[PDB]
Predict the structure.
Amino acid sequence: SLWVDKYRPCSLGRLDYHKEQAAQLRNLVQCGDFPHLLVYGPSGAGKKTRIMCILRELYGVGVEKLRIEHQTITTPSKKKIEISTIASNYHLEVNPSDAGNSDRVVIQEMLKTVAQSQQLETNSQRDFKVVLLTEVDKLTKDAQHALRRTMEKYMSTCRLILCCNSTSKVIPPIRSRCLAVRVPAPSIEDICHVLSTVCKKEGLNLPSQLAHRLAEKSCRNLRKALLMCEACRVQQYPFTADQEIPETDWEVYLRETANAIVSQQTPQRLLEVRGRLYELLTHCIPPEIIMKGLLSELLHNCDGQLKGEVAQMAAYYEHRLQLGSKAIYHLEAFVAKFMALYKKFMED
Amino acid sequence: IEPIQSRCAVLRYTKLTDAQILTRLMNVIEKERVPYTDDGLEAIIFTAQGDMRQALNNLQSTFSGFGFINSENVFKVCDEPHPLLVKEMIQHCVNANIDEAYKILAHLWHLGYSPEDIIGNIFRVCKTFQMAEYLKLEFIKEIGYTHMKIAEGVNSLLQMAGLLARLCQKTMAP
Amino acid sequence: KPVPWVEKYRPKCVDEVAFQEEVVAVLKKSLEGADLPNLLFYGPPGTGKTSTILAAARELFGPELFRLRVLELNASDERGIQVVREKVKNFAQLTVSGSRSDGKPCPPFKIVILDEADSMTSAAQAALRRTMEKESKTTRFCLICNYVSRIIEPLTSRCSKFRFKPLSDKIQQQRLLDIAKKENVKISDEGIAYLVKVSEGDLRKAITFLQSATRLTGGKEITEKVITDIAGVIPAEKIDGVFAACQSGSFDKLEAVVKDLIDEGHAATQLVNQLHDVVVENNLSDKQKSIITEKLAEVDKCLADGADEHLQLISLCATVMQQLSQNC
Amino acid sequence: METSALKQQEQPAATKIRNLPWVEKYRPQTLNDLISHQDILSTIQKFINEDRLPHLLLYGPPGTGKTSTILACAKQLYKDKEFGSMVLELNASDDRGIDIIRGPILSFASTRTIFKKGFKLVILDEADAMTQDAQNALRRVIEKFTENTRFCLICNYLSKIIPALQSRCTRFRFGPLTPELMVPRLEHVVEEEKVDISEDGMKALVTLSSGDMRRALNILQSTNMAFGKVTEETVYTCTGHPLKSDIANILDWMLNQDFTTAYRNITELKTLKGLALHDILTEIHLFVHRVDFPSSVRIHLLTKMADIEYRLSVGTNEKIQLSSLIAAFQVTRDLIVAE
Amino acid sequence: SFQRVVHVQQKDDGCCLWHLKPPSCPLLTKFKELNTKVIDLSKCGIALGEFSTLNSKLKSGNSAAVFMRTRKEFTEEVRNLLLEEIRWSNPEFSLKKYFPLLLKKQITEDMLWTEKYQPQTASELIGNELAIKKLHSWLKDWKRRAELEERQNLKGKEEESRLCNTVLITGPTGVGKTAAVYACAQELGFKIFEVNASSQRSGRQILSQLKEATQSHQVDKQGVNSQKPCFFNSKNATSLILFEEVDVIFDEDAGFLNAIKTFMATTKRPVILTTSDPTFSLMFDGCFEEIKFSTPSLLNVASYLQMICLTENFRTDVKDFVTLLTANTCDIRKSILYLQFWIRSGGGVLEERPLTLLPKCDSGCAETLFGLKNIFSPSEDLFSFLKHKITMKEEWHKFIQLLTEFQMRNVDFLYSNLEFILPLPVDTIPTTAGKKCSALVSHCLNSLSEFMDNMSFLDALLTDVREQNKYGRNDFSWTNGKVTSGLCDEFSLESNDGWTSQSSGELKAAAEALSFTKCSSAISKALETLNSCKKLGRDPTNDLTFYVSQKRNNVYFSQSAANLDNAWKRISVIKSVFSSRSLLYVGNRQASIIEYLPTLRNICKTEKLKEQGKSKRRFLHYFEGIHLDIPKETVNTLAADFP
Ligand SMILES: Nc1ncnc2c1ncn2[C@@H]1O[C@H](COP(=O)(O)OP(=O)(O)OP(O)(O)=S)[C@@H](O)[C@H]1O
Ligand SMILES: Nc1ncnc2c1ncn2[C@@H]1O[C@H](COP(=O)(O)OP(=O)(O)OP(O)(O)=S)[C@@H](O)[C@H]1O
Ligand SMILES: Nc1ncnc2c1ncn2[C@@H]1O[C@H](COP(=O)(O)OP(=O)(O)O)[C@@H](O)[C@H]1O
Ligand SMILES: Nc1ncnc2c1ncn2[C@@H]1O[C@H](COP(=O)(O)OP(=O)(O)O)[C@@H](O)[C@H]1O
Ligand SMILES: [Mg+2]
Ligand SMILES: [Mg+2]
């Protein structure tokens, strides 16, 4: 229990930002027939805590207890797949993107069991059970078609909550029937407010300069800000205005990878950069995150006309990375094309 | 499954080289009084890509249908898109002649051949085509991209016309 | 217990629909002999195809039997075409006895409302053709589709084709005001104009958006901001900021603008749509419009494939910046 | 089981006072009546009559005359007094998994004849719908009982058949008919039915059917009852196909005026005629090779149009893809014209 | 009936678009006349070898090389020399205590080598010494309890002990779980009652036929006792129950889990559970002692197979065995069986290699393991084939066949061994002349970048034979990956495509071979000019070296370019960290590791650095001070560094 979940708000009245949206979601809940929700926004914005607040407003306090169960579903290709699940008496939470192209093997089946439970469990509180869908943006085309037919079939049976970061990959049929809840990232002052409130509730005091530095370093990620504040608490018992905020280890590793890319353009350096990217990939860092970090740390050393070409190359190879399966090929292909272009730029 | 492979010894078989299929074809021919020519042998070997059962079945079918083994008889009884037509189309694409290459492609399309066997025969002819290594690599890459597009579901003459053109612009552009 | 307004506020019967004259005439001539042929309704979405034929089925069949003898199916099933084939097969296999108390014997056929008919492959349409000719007399089909030209030859040659021309903005605003006054929600008429501008002629999306705004605001005034957040439309000042950053020619402010749009939660597909709508209706040169619109098409394709919104948007904005700075 | 009373009832089924089954009006009865694929039916007679009938693999586009052809061969080879006892016609319509292979086919193939001694035959329709392991069982059944029974696999696409099943059988492709030979039949049916068609409507019928007799009869019959006369506009409006005038005007807009006016006009025409971008791309591609373009212009247009057609398949915004289609012509042909 | 069909369109008068005519511009009116005249193929006859690799000349005498191998029995001296050679190859291996046991085992044949060299004594198990120590000790307490029961019975006429009545052994396939329990049972005189998936085991069946084995004595206590009666229904020896492959549950095995739980509650004799599914230990409820067989060390199993071949008068190198075990992912049984097949066929090839660290060595087992000897002539080496340029059609077909045989496994051969086969120096990790050297380096880098762009093209824009991430997500993932195989007898009934795999593999193989040929030819052309730069005095050969790992240099060829042990450790510590009770309820997975894990490692590293400076002891009370129930070895793992 770190500071990120010990002080997570439990009801819609305890939220500190997006208060108008919180009141709108409360009015949504009080109508009694709230629709499928499509909650989206950047990572660390506060989508999950708002969904939890909605769930605590819908049902009683009993949603606050959770339990983990494992479900083994037989694929139509006759190869059983077992997935984990967080659940309660009133709601289910699932992430079928873990099932690969067999995500529909979750989608057409799992919620069906919940629908079965909706004719098995009777509570006389509400006529539905909320199914939370995490990382619905990572589903495939046929998985989303299965989800569409599923919410058509069990509309009056269960309600759907779809949490994502980007609604670009989701189909327009899946958006045409869900109420869209856009949760933007909190501002700097809002992160400072949350950090000061969380430090006061713990009994410590942090200066406004340190809170502003943490909020600026978090890149409008509230969870990253809370984790960095906890790390600063670990480093020093009192909070000083000049206390060094510690940096992320894989981020600084990516920074030295970019420095090694820039420094020398040789096949040997290309092989060490490939080894570094393999080391990052073995740490379960997503390759899209690696590409974004590499582009962010390579555009500092670039020149104005080179920046557009480098950004377009990074986008091209990241789309190739999405299409392919072995991401090291696309990562190092972007890397090697960048060293070739950078060398050609530096010779002239 | 993996424990079954663990409890055994896995031995690997590969496709038969056309030399071996030719030797067995001569063995069957010399024990069956089958009149033949060299072009019919090349056609039978082409229609059976590394398969000995397909080679024997095509030889028997051509002997039963016409009684002589030449190329026109083999391709009358097997009905692939003709490798002479596909070779001429690929040669036109090497010379960046979109008009004649599309003339051959549209003639093949109006003969009722599917996209799948047309692109398969295009790849099979292009595998042994006599051109430079870089041009062969670009041709194979574009043929593979188009074949993947056909396999995904979009299989029209527009896709094949766009390939011939991506093949023409490989040579017409540096 | 309750039902959303988009199906519960449909026309009950034929000729209650609006802005269709020939369609209603031939439909009424079909209802007069109680002989409804195979139907093919094509037009823009939300034009009122489904409401019209559901009204026709309510005219033809009794309301206790109208739900029993119609079956709404979707053609974008990912499990193949044999699933909907066996579904219509065992829907028409059952012959449950029904009658009307008004003094008219019911016609024996059933109705299959098969929507998104233009999303079917040619083989799937051929399987549907063989299913329709199998069930030639026991059930007469209808196909709701967006475009008539996607439906292959044997199906389109035998179903009567009806075009649903899109409703104008004024009739849509009148209908939306009717819904607002009848449902007791207080919303100003310029907000309703904003609703019909945002939905872009999709009356069904407009009704759904109005219901969502009513049940999300809480009986207070529906401002344009609530509608904008519900529909996912990016406000025009963000688009103007993107274009100003591209016209500046500096990459850092372009990155700042793209990051500001990304961390606000705004979708990249909506931004691509609004940039395209801005670009195709400006005083740009033809070559600039061509390059920008081609790049927008490839960026839309890459975003559908799951590529990162930040990288795709910064590549598109770099292309737009180069196009806007190569002439100045 | 079953699924056989419907066809038996359907064969002598017509209202006979009002209905006009034009497709069922002109059907061949034997191999001397189907005037098409003369090489194929001749070599089938040559195979049957000398007692060397092999395993057959009949494929091709549907409606080319495969099932009725093999019905004619089965009826001319076996009399009606012994037809049902030694000819077994199944298909993939009756599928409960793969049990049909180890059930009816394996039982039928492994036993001798009952009444009249001879060789038996299995007809298997839409054999491409079988699974891979069902074909792997069928090839073993064919291999070990090739002397007793022969097999005839009627499929639509040859690419869905495993290589060993294709290796056991000789293949017959039923291609589309040279559009020219179809015309005599169309003049025959218009002379019989007393209808008014111009030569342009004839051209429309032979370019829409792509060498299919049944679809030609369907379209001609439907346009006849719809209008009473058939010209290209009348058939194309009843069919709901992109008219040649509409595609020519679309091409003229994309070649002549600017981006915005052409885009607005094409959007108006698409909403007006119910036209999709896929069929626009198909007809524009057909128009590209009949219009005198330079080779580089043609290559550029074909590459761009193929890219747009691929992009439409994954489910992108049709409006932006239409703008890219306009852009493909605006890149090359407009500045070629203005030079 | 036969109603008419009409196309009703709301065609209002006007709009300038409903009634349209062809345009009057001359560009779209002069339609080009279509011609169907194609060239005539009757006159053009097809020459031999035009579309294939057919040659008029044929090789005679080069093929059909019969071995006729008569392996002489090795003398004692050369046996001692080869034993010392394996001693040099494996300094940590104790060579002397294993050879006489295998000599006794070997001292016309009719059984497999897996049961010919079956370990009869538990110390002959290779690796997993903690697991076999725990199992041997546990069976010692159970035999002690059986002897105590016998002593109590003859005299008549347990939290502190914590002797749980069952263990669950889990591990990979073929590491030796069943061999370990059989060896321990033979050592301690147990009598194994094996219940496997090859026999009908329904719940009432196994209950009513095997409870009395646990609850009662054995009627025959002396004589022929240490046997293995496999249950089915179509010194004193203590009974033992073994449940082989418990994760395999069928519909006919009705209530098998309830039956084995009833066995668990009411037994008086030891019970072993053997499985290879890691999820079962989390799925099964009950108290059992967990025993995990980790994957054994590659050098130890390599020396064990070297012992096996040395006993059979065969001399081999450890590198070929390391390649074989890397390809077989350290499966001991699969390696032993393939070694038996390959040795009893007459070995690979007769080659001489002088090693002191003598009969001719027998390298080449991994080459014929993948069937590459079926493509190549027996005078052709694989890397010698890859290094030289390729011009003639027949060895082009050989290259294509090599790559497509390696492509059915979805394995990238030329990428995994790119350094060792490119014409560039490879080393294991421990002015106008400058313009010319930089130009050569840029040429090499451009060729490499073009090749690997082409390979990204192949990986993304071409069809793959096996559908990747079919049941899980892509590689290096922590959330799942435990996709067990099917357990049901009904068929798949799928609509997969077979043409788009057979053609796809050939297409990918051809494109990969062509791209590698282009890159290698360009690099060789660039290195042709290295003599001019060496004459100029500047040497960029160092800038041209390839720095590969030591473990990648131990193989003839690698199956992958990564470190699998590293990745398995990282995913394992991720599951270990996020299996903690407070962190089980974190919703997401991507941002969960991305944000939670590095600050956890940062807090661990700060705690370790604070404890390295001799501060107060209360500083070690941060993690459990806020109730982070996380195991300590994972905390020490996070506190080390970030690689
Ligand atoms: N070449 C042709 N000329 C005239 N009529 C034809 C021709 N081909 C087919 N037909 C008609 O099509 C009817 C049915 O033929 P079939 O053999 O069933 O067609 P098919 O090729 O097997 O394709 P199917 O059955 O639709 S999957 C015949 O009775 C004829 O009326
Ligand atoms: N560590 C080992 N030492 C010696 N021989 C071994 C070893 N591991 C496997 N073997 C040999 O390989 C054979 C098969 O081993 P098993 O114990 O059956 O494999 P396993 O651990 O049970 O995995 P399964 O049963 O395939 S899931 C044994 O009988 C031995 O001959
Ligand atoms: N109103 C708030 N007050 C205090 N803390 C908050 C508030 N909203 C969010 N947080 C904190 O920020 C983090 C947001 O994480 P999460 O809910 O998972 O959002 P996302 O799903 O977008 O990452 C939570 O750990 C929570 O503790
Ligand atoms: N012409 C019309 N007359 C009356 N109501 C209409 C008309 N067109 C649309 N609507 C209303 O708009 C909604 C459109 O729903 P639907 O019929 O599904 O549209 P479509 O079938 O065009 O997709 C319905 O709720 C209906 O009440
Ligand atoms: Mg047929
Ligand atoms: Mg075992």
